[PDB]
Design a protein around this ligand. Structure first.
Ligand SMILES: CC(=O)N[C@H]1[C@H]([C@H](O)[C@H](O)CO)O[C@@](O)(C(=O)O)C[C@@H]1O
Ligand SMILES: [Ca+2]
Ligand SMILES: [Ca+2]
Ligand SMILES: [Ca+2]
Ligand SMILES: [Ca+2]
Ligand SMILES: [Cl-]
Ligand SMILES: [Cl-]
Ligand SMILES: [Cl-]
Ligand SMILES: [Cl-]
Lengths: 281, 234, 57, 264
């Protein structure tokens, strides 16, 4: 299937007036060039292949950067650097989020890919053997680690991937896991109804998708015990929506995000650059 | 084992690759689908919807609701009412339309652009307005007598509120670039009083029209890219 | 269970797919779907509007 | 004889006439309907109140002035205190509804102005404090039939506790997108020289078959003056905008004692 060909047409002198309409109806303009000019025949062999939803979304996008370290930790703060936990979301970054938010609702499987990088913290503390990483998906309710070597990492039921530094970026598919019939990109509501004369706090409650969304937690550790040389790591998380359906198109984000909601920032709500005059080519 | 030999590309992560991968949640039972209204299949479906051009984005009106309405009056000036380049991805006024926003995820565009004008004066206001598209390579039109040598429509104001002017696909290249570019310049859209707006007494002598842009069914885009319209601090 | 399908044309043409995994979520991209109905957004009107006829009669 | 400008709508015991319409919109080309057995979720026999609830309710009128920046309502919030619809809504955990929205604004052949009338699925709006995100009280999110107004200024609160309302900034559609692109949503325009009414028929829209009406608004209704009201003899004149909405194909599940939401 191709985009529209142009038919051979000459002029008109007619009570048929395709150039006029009434957009008050909620209909967009419909007229095409053959309605208002003399046209030649042009066969259109060109297709809209690359603007299908699958084509538009068919990219692995970075959604977050996580940090983990491997060293001899002697303080609570340093023990907490030996592993990391991250609430799974696309709202840490802006690019994939903005593309998804052309739509109100979506349904897709997810390809997740990871890029893992290291550097030496210092040069005077010898070397470090090649590191193995554990990335554990903790679904809502499953116990979260409090130490890099606690019982949770045995991962009998949670899916884990063990990644060997220098190997191909690890990758796995996630089904459409939504508890509704589609994912909601926008939710105009609350998680509960506050009732007349209840003692529950109404002063510090939130609004929208943040009150209801929970895709669980990614937990990452270096499996190796400490070397004399401290190693610091970054884990870049990539998402590609595949087998995509979307519903109810929206105007795209016009101004910077300032969090997980639709809120905007007072110093960043002037996207247009003023033109010199209404008559500026 | 089966003798194999690794080729170039082995172990790379290409972000536009299209491979199978093991499922982390095997034999998961997805929520059954239901019919939801408003399913979209193609971004070009969204490009065919009219959205308002912020045509009057001048100092004091840019980034206000007053950036959209195009000033009209009953004075019959020979000066153009508005003038804009056919640069639908890169122009300061077209880039933030729905079509402009979609084009800024692509490198290449082709096809015809539809400009629909809604007159929002009183019922008692009459007028004739010339809407012109001049393909590029000549003096940009600043007078009606130059504008009327191009592709144009004479709009008679009346019961039918709206008039559609086409910028038909007229290009050397098969695609134009979604950037400001001399080689793929699109030409000039202008607007003049053909007669003038006339009102009787007890009627506003100044008023507005709204300009909408949409893609025609001959329109398509290529070469997915990141937009310059969203960013974040690092 | 090999699927043979048309490739997207290049400069100047079938390809073979076998699914290796028991979960459809594991599969490569959905095949090109050229489905469209812009009218649900561009003309969602109750009464048919004929382009050549007046929008308001 | 039959005209795109002249329409009658009857639902239950209620009828609307208009002699200056501009066709009617059916959002996403889909008429509302009851929930099919093959898409159903809650298993209790639903209440289908039909004519008691599926009828035109007229909200308090608002005044269009040369200085008005616009109006918003949420649905089903705007109808929560409307006759038997409100009673069926609050006696049940779950509800679904379509709507006929009829926006009414007449003037004269000497007045000018244009209202954009938009039906927005999941109309999530920005909060009015930069100390927090997504920080809106239930009471401010759910004003009922009075709805709210847009502003042309954004003045977020000094203290988080004072900013728990929508920053309904007109040109960003109160949600960080440009208002000029609102036409991607089901809409009509009331252009005073052309028409005195807008009619939008809305199916139920959600990622679920049925949901908690007291927790979740499915639709926003936005009325924006695209072109300001002008009248040469009196620039300070006001003309009413009247909103009349009929629930359609209403269906409720999970009957119990009545929901009485917090009012402060
Ligand atoms: C992350 C970082 O900046 N590391 C730097 C360290 C540390 O600052 C100190 O070793 C800590 O005391 O110092 C170096 O001179 C080193 O050890 O060779 C360079 C190295 O890049
Ligand atoms: Ca063709
Ligand atoms: Ca017509
Ligand atoms: Ca012709
Ligand atoms: Ca009944
Ligand atoms: Cl272990
Ligand atoms: Cl070890
Ligand atoms: Cl109320
Ligand atoms: Cl209360």
């Amino acid at each position: 299937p191709t985009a529209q060909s142009t038919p051979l047409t000459s002029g008109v002198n007619s009570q048929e007036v395709p150039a006029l309409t009434a957009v008050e109806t909620g209909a967009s303009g419909q007229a095409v060039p053959s309605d208002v000019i003399e046209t030649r025949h042009v066969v259109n062999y060109k297709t809209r292949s690359e603007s299908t939803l699958e084509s538009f979304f068919g990219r692995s996008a970075c959604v977050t950067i996580l940090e983990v370290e491997n060293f001899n930790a002697t303080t609570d703060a340093d023990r907490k650097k030996q592993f990391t936990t991250w609430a799974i979301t696309y709202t840490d970054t802006v690019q994939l989020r903005r593309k998804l938010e052309f739509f109100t609702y979506s349904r897709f499987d997810l390809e997740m890919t990871f890029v893992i990088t290291e550097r030496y913290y210092a040069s005077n503390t010898g070397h470090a053997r090649n590191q193995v990483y554990q990335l554990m998906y903790i679904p809502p309710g499953a116990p979260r680690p409090t130490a890099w070597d606690d019982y949770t990492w045995q991962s009998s039921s949670n899916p884990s991937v063990f990644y060997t530094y220098g190997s191909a970026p690890p990758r796995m598919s996630i089904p459409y896991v939504g508890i509704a019939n589609a994912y909601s990109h926008f939710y105009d509501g609350f998680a509960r109804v506050p009732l007349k004369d209840e003692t529950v706090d109404s002063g510090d409650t939130y609004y929208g998708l943040v009150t209801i969304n929970d895709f669980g937690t990614l937990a990452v550790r270096v499996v190796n015990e400490y070397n004399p040389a401290r190693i610091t790591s970054k884990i870049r998380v990539y998402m590609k929506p595949k087998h995509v359906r979307c519903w109810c198109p929206r105007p795209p984000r016009a101004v910077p995000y300032r969090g997980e909601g639709v809120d905007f920032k007072q110093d960043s709500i002037t996207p247009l650059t003023a033109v010199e005059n209404i008559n500026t080519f | 084992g089966l003798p194999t030999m690794l080729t170039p590309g082995s172990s790379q992560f290409l972000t536009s690759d299209d491979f199978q991968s093991p499922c982390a949640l095997p034999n998961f039972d997805v929520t059954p689908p239901i019919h939801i209204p408003g399913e979209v299949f193609n971004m070009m479906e969204l490009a065919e919807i009219d959205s308002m051009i912020p045509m009057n984005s001048v100092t004091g009106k840019a980034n206000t609701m007053e950036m959209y309405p195009i000033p009209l009056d009953d004075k019959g000036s020979a000066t153009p009412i508005f003038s804009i380049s056919l640069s639908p991805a890169s122009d300061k006024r077209l880039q933030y339309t729905m079509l402009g926003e979609i084009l800024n995820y692509y490198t290449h565009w082709t096809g015809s652009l539809r400009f629909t004008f809604l007159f929002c004066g009183s019922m008692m206001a009459t007028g004739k307005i010339l809407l012109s598209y001049s393909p590029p390579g000549a003096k940009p039109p600043t007078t009606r007598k130059d504008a009327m040598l191009g592709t144009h429509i004479i709009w008679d104001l009346g019961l039918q509120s709206s008039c559609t002017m086409l910028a038909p696909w007229i290009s050397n290249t098969v695609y134009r670039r979604c950037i400001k570019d001399d080689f793929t310049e699109g030409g000039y859209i202008t607007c003049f009083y053909q007669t003038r707006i006339v009102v009787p007494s007890g009627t506003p002598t100044s008023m507005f029209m709204l300009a909408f842009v949409s893609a025609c069914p001959d329109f398509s885009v290529r070469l997915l890219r990141d937009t310059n319209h969203i960013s974040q601090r690092t | 269970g090999a699927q043979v399908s048309s490739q997207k044309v290049g400069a100047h043409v079938n390809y073979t797919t076998i699914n290796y995994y028991k979960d459809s979520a594991s599969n490569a991209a959905s095949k090109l779907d050229f489905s469209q109905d812009p009218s649900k957004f561009t003309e969602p009107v109750k009464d048919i509007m004929i382009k050549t006829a007046p929008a308001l009669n | 004889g039959y005209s795109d400008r002249v329409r009658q709508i009857t639902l239950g015991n209620s009828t609307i006439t208009t002699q200056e319409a501009a066709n009617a919109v059916v959002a996403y080309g889909e008429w509302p309907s009851y929930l099919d057995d093959k898409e159903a979720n809650p298993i209790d026999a639903p209440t289908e109140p039909d004519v008691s609830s599926n009828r035109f309710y007229t909200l308090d009128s608002v005044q269009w002035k040369s200085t008005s920046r616009g109006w918003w309502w949420k649905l089903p919030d705007a109808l929560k205190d409307m006759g038997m619809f409100g009673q069926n809504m609050y006696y049940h955990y779950l509800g679904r509804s379509g709507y006929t929205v009829h926006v009414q604004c007449n003037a004269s052949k000497f007045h000018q102005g244009a209202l954009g009338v938009f039906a927005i699925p999941e109309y999530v709006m920005a909060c009015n404090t930069e100390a927090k995100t997504s920080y809106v009280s239930y009471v401010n999110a759910n004003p009922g039939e009075k709805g709210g107004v847009f502003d042309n200024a954004y003045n977020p609160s000094a203290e988080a506790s004072e900013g728990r309302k929508f920053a309904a900034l007109d040109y960003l559609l109160g949600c960080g997108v440009l208002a000029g692109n609102a036409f991607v949503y089901p809409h009509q325009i009331i252009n005073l020289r052309t028409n005195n009414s807008a009619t939008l028929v809305l199916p139920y829209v959600n990622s679920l078959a049925i949901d908690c009406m007291a927790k979740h608004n499915n639709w926003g209704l936005v009325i924006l003056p695209l072109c300001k009201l002008d009248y040469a003899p009196n620039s300070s004149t006001e003309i009413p905008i009247t909103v009349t909405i009929a629930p359609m194909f209403t269906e409720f599940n999970g009957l119990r004692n009545i929901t009485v939401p917090a009012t402060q």
